[PDB]
Write a protein that binds this ligand. Structure first.
Ligand SMILES: *C(=O)N1C[C@H](NOS(=O)(=O)O)CC[C@H]1C(=O)NC1CCNCC1
Length: 268
């Protein structure tokens, strides 16, 4: 049921000047669209969705976790911390940092939450615990964005991203209340309007998390999509390119998402 219908991903990536990796699953039939799906691509900010899921998993054992207020210093505010910079003088709760990391891609929030989990290895351990043997987080913000060609640090594959996203949003990897909180955070993302969402009809529900490393044409998005009248679709679209100053493209991500939906025979 993989690639029943071929789609022109090769032409798309050639025009982009790099590589595009796609994995999309129709959770009803199990049909898939797969292109470069087992290659590694940098996560960039996209690790923050999984980070929030890991915090939610912890919260199942620690009922006071999400309400815990976290104070932080000005030194915590690395570049691109749009929410946490507004609460420097007050603090934010763990839940609020999680929402900020997911919905505004807040970097300070992400580092504070990584500390809660025991760092990159702690997040990696959570991903192993759900059966993902591909994901690896190695570094913190901002160093994890280097996106060096051939470097496996801070990467996953489109396939493993999709598989893990399915387990966490639709499967049993989180308890039901936490699963719905994760979904709600993804649905409230503000940074993805020009990526997978641009390929998804306005009357379908969707949650996503983006990433943009800033170098090597490297950017991404993953999403759960609920078309009306049929089972949800999970998909991941990752890009990279050979040269350090190659620019990412949101349009290319949207276009790859459209091809994926077409390949699944989802009328959109
Ligand atoms: C994540 O990849 N980020 C965080 C933020 N927006 O995330 S995104 O998924 O919407 O793109 C800005 C881009 C990126 C990031 O951390 N970039 C570094 C900090 C800002 N200067 C460039 C490198």
């Amino acid at each position: 049921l993989t690639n029943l219908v071929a789609e022109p991903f090769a032409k798309l990536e050639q025009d982009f000047g790099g590589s595009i990796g796609v994995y999309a699953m129709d959770t009803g039939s199990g049909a898939t669209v797969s292109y470069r799906a087992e290659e590694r691509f940098p996560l960039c900010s996209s690790f923050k969705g999984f980070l929030a899921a890991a915090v939610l998993a912890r919260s199942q054992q620690q009922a006071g976790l999400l309400d815990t207020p976290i104070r932080y210093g000005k030194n915590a505010l690395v570049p691109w911390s749009p929410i946490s910079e507004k609460y420097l003088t007050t603090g934010m709760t763990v839940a609020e940092l999680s929402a900020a990391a997911v919905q505004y891609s807040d970097n300070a929030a992400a580092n504070l939450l990584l500390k809660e989990l025991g760092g990159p290895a702690g997040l990696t351990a959570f991903m192993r615990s759900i059966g993902d043997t591909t994901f690896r987080l190695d570094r913190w913000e901002l160093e994890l964005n280097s996106a060096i060609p051939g470097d496996a640090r801070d990467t996953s594959s489109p396939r493993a991203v999709t598989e893990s996203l399915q387990k966490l949003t639709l499967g049993s990897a989180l308890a039901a209340p936490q699963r719905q909180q994760f979904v709600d955070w993804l649905k409230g993302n503000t940074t993805g309007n020009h990526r997978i969402r641009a390929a998804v009809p306005a009357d379908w529900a969707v949650g996503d998390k983006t990433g943009t490393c800033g170098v090597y044409g490297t950017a991404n998005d993953y999403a759960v999509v609920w078309p009306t009248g049929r089972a949800p679709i999970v998909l991941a679209v990752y890009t990279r390119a050979p040269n350090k100053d190659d620019k990412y493209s949101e349009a290319v991500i949207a276009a790859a998402a459209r091809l994926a939906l077409e390949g699944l025979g989802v009328n959109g």
